[PDB]
Paper text:
We show that AcrIF9 inhibits the crRNA-guided surveillance complex (Csy) by sterically blocking the hybridization of target DNA to the crRNA guide. Overall, the complex maintains the previously described seahorse-shape, comprising a hexameric Cas7f “backbone” that is capped on one end by the Cas6f “head”, while the other end is capped by a heterodimeric Cas8f and Cas5f “tail”. AcrIF9 is a 7.9 kDa protein made up of a five stranded, anti-parallel beta sheet cradling an alpha helix, a fold distinct from AcrIF1.
In addition, Q11 of AcrIF9 also hydrogen bonds with a nucleobase from the crRNA (C13 to AcrIF9.1 and U25 to AcrIF9.2 respectively). A second cluster of hydrogen bonding interactions is found between AcrIF9 R17 and residues S89 and S92 in the Cas7f thumb. Furthermore, the aromatic sidechains of AcrIF9 residues F39, F40, and H41 form an “aromatic clamp” around residues L76 to T78 of Cas7f and additional hydrogen bonding occurs between AcrIF9 residues Q38 to H41 and Cas7f residues R75 to T78. AcrIF9.1, but not AcrIF9.2, also interacts with Cas8f through hydrogen bonding of the Cas8f R224 carbonyl with AcrIF9.1 the L27 backbone nitrogen. Based on the similarity of the binding sites for AcrIF1 and AcrIF9, we predicted that AcrIF9 would sterically block target binding.
Residue numbers in the entry:
A (entry chain G): 25 to 252, 260 to 357
B (entry chain H): 25 to 357
C (entry chain J), D (entry chain I): 3 to 66
E (entry chain B): 3 to 222, 239 to 322
F (entry chain A): 38 to 84, 168 to 434
Write the structure that this text describes.
Amino acid sequence: LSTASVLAFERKLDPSDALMSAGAWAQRDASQEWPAVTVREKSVRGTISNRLKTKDRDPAKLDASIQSPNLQTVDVANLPSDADTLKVRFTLRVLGGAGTPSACNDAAYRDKLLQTVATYVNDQGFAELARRYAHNLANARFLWRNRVGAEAVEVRINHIRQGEVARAWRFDALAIGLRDFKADAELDALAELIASGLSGSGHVLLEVVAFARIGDGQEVFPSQELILQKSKTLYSVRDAAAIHSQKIGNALRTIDTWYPDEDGLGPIAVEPYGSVTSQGKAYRQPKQKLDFYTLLDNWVLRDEAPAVEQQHYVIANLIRGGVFGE
Amino acid sequence: LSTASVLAFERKLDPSDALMSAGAWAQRDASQEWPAVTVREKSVRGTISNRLKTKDRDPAKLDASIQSPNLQTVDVANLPSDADTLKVRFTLRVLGGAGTPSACNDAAYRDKLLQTVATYVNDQGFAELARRYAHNLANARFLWRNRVGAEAVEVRINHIRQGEVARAWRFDALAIGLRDFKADAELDALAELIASGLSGSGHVLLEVVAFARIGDGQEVFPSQELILDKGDKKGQKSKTLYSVRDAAAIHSQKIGNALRTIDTWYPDEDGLGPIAVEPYGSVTSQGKAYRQPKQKLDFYTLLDNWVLRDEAPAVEQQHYVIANLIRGGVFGE
Amino acid sequence: STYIIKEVQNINSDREGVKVETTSLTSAKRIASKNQFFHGTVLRIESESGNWLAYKEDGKRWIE
Amino acid sequence: STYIIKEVQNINSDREGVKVETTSLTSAKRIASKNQFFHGTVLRIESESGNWLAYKEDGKRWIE
Amino acid sequence: VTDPEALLLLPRLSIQNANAISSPLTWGFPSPGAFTGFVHALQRRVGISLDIELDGVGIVCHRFEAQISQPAGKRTKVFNLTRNPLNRDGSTAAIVEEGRAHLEVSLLLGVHGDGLDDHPAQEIARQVQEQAGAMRLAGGSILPWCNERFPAPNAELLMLGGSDEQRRKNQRRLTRRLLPGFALVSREALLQQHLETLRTTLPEATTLDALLDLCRINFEWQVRDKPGWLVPIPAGYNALSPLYLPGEVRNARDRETPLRFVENLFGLGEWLSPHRVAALSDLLWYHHAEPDKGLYRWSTPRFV
Amino acid sequence: QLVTHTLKPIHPDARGSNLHSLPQAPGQPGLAGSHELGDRLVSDVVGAPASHSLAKQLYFPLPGSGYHLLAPLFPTSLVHHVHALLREARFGDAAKAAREARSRQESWPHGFSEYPNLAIQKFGGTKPQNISQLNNERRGENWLLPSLPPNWQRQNVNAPMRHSSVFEHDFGRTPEVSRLTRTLQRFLAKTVHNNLAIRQRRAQLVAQICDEALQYAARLRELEPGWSATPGCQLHDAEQLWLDPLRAQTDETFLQRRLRGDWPAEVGNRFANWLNRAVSSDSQILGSPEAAQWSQELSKELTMFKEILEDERD
């Protein structure tokens, strides 16, 4: 019973674009019609800050470059003239059927996978993954630079059912530990709702709206769009700044903390081979048996159930979805 | 009496492109001017997570690839800032004369085929195929990813007669079983209308409009347009979505293929639901082709036997053969 | 002859590549295939400039 | 070919120019460079009409 | 070139996934033969029921939208192909060349049958439109006119009766609704004129078409001027082999008529606004065949 | 084998009778075909006439006779000939210098022709060798010619009710008319020697202006549901009468009543003045022979233009 050369799993928990706006912390109770932050252009005089080879460089060569600097145009987004609070609004949907494979070459493999998934669900539910996801949704971990140096960050996660707000929730990213997961009644309720949606007990829609105190006329750091002079290109939708769907889903999936290093990095995004771009190192290297592909191959062909931690990581990967096999 | 080296049957039930728009479910009934969804461009920065080939004894080599990400451009379609309901509108026509062959080398073969078709119709009508198609049209089975994760899907089929007046209907895809076919007054009426159109009533036009609740700012998934031109330089997009009149849509054949997913008599019939009516029971997603030629259930073999030897196969095989003839194609050699 | 060997998921993508500095392009193709780190990647050989020299899909033969 | 050679501090300006009546643009360019009356001026070649044919900055190469 | 008694004008006929190649060396608007044969196939079925005669077919293209993408490597565009189903062997399908596009066109059907007077004109028009809707023109489905606005009916008008004043008023009324689109006509006068003009240099026909259909630049610099839009078209198919009895040609789809191997023949057509044309009858395309020579052309002779 | 037609590039499964060559030239002088060359025939080696389903057989009607099916083939010699003729033009050091001269403005004796909007077609797909007479470089390198009508490129139509386009609506400048006006205004500098040919190109260029103008109004009326009151109605009153919407259900019956008894006659004057101001002329040349023909052409064009709108209201 070999594997299928073609294997794909549709991603789950796919959110939508995140719109941004500005306003006054006082008006936080009423936040509608606020004008969006429009990107603008400003000239910046380029400078030589790169590390040049001392062997190639010389005293005259340096004075030559700084003599005629290379001008470069960039794009920046700043809050309105009078605005001290930034607002971000993005929705989230729960599709479900994570273990259900989208396409498989062999039927036996698909049946074995569905059986293993049903067995795992029966033994223990997704409540653990839902609880971990609840913390990430509650806190502002999704923000990369806007969160750093913020006075007050307030997240509001509502529940949209049949077009109405079934139940609202309000949390505090600052109060909630960034590197520590603490239990709360609201977090448990949200985790239960997510587990139900994933299990297929009903449609689940959550509208997350965050309000972060940055400062008057501050400069927000939106997602820079790919370049085709103009060097920095910001991604604007309908003349409004936003964050990429994948850019949000990457932070929202920071649930991988069982790496073999136990360093101070903290939450790591679920990615095959535990690759990290910023750190430049990939934990869970293929040499070990903890790799996702090896764990799934063993638990499928040899029916070897790995540690609960590895099983959770494998289920998280299947939920995120991707392309496997060959 | 040998077969004809050249055999072709014009396809029937050929739909057109499906326009899409976004709006509020409350105004969907009273507002049909919903603006179309315009395609947009986005950039993604991902790592290479594919399976490794070289030995895993080189840890540094792996970390190196991680330092270099993968950059590409794609196309996405998202609803307007304030829109939670997606609308899709597409028409369908019924030509008729499925059994009537378009071209045949020998006249005797054509006459025998017409006689067998008339005999089958007299014995039992196409009401079975019409009923199966009615379920597909009523439900959202045509949608591949838009249906998954939907709050409420409402389909409305309008029979456009000589005038604007029509018998507009309203169904529920969620309430209707996806893997089970149940009888209903509206389904029977639709099947009768389809059978009449196929029999040659004179004119049949059905405008199907669907409204699916997805969410504010959600992303629709249109049919990617194949290009096949890799190009000699960079500065191109890796994913191109099919768009007409600056509006996203789904291919006509891509819609007509899903709508005709009534082939449930395949030999395996083990967990799989409806499948597209195609020769050799090929499946792209599953990558397997049921009804292999080695068996006697093959469409070509069954038709050859029922024509030359006049052997009437099981009612299921006859239904499948009539469905394939309705779909149309090129057979023989 | 300096040739930049790059790897990407789809034939259409931008990524840095290693400089082989090989004598001939065919030699470059063989070296790239030997150094492939992946099964689903699309090998793309490019010169020092922005002109694309050649590409090879995972399930397809070399193309120029 | 009548070409109007003009000199200005910045590419954006409205100053009159001499009519060379040269055969090709390369001739007008070589003439402007050989007879350049200023170091920091920006050469601007234009046809008899108001259409700008080409420009050249003090520290930059010819551009069209 | 029979004088048509009446003319039926199809207001708007949409087509999807039509044939946009029309020729081995050219691509674009479909060959006129596809439209001419269509009216012929309709007359063979409805002509007997309604006792009407259709010999002239006018073509007016209102909207043409192809499916092409321009690559970044070169300035030559490419078409958007489709995905073929998996082969019976289970291996991946083979990619094949194909074309698709959205074509909104209006056809003029010349009614030469005297029996039209014996039946209502509106009923004849509706009966013809009903078959035209179910029919497939150019190789694709014909999407009827259905939208928020009211539908567009087919109008048949007799051009035989009435004074020249009424005839001109009718032609103006028709051009008023046919202005958004451009008509199609065959122009062989300029083609033969240029052929004889450049015959001294070399007797090459394809070279003349290639030179005419391109951006010509003259040394001064200057660009050559044309009075109107001129483009090559498939005037017809020339006979490449002698006629063979139905038995001689193997795998023939019919034993009633003999098979003949033919080749491709190009030409030069011109796009002129309907207001430019004076007589509408000159727009209708008439198929002419020669039994001796295998030359078969749909060019409208009355246009010259 | 050597043949002038093959089914390998046309279809992979296409098999049938391939003619060795054309013994006679059936192509008439009135048209252009492969039979008109009779030379430069290139036939490569592939790898009871019979046909196949993919032969694309099509019936042809006959006057008062039966039907004849035609099974066309894929011309290879003509295709290769046209391909080489266009390759030597687009490429080569000879044509290369020609295009470079255009940028330098040098009046080089040779003239280079361009082929915009070209299309590429691949033969054999993954296995180009399967195609007959298709070499390694010749496979998929065969480019076609664009036959799309000039109206293939369609853009949006915008007619707002504000003053931004209310004042400039009368002009309606379009990229199609902009390229024609530059060619038309270039024929006014010709001397008496060039006045012989100017009597045809300039005469034909006037009709194209009215044609491109009427198309804009037609597309506007066929895309905009209507236009309400707008600012700048002093000179724009005549333009608003070009595109007439239907009377609204909630409106009065005095809108159509006033427009019914009024004929659009100022549109011609506004168009004539617009063209006069758009195209430059010389004052001293008013008493020359060119001015007479220019006024005659403008009058002939204005007459047909006014006549076209006269039947619109009536």
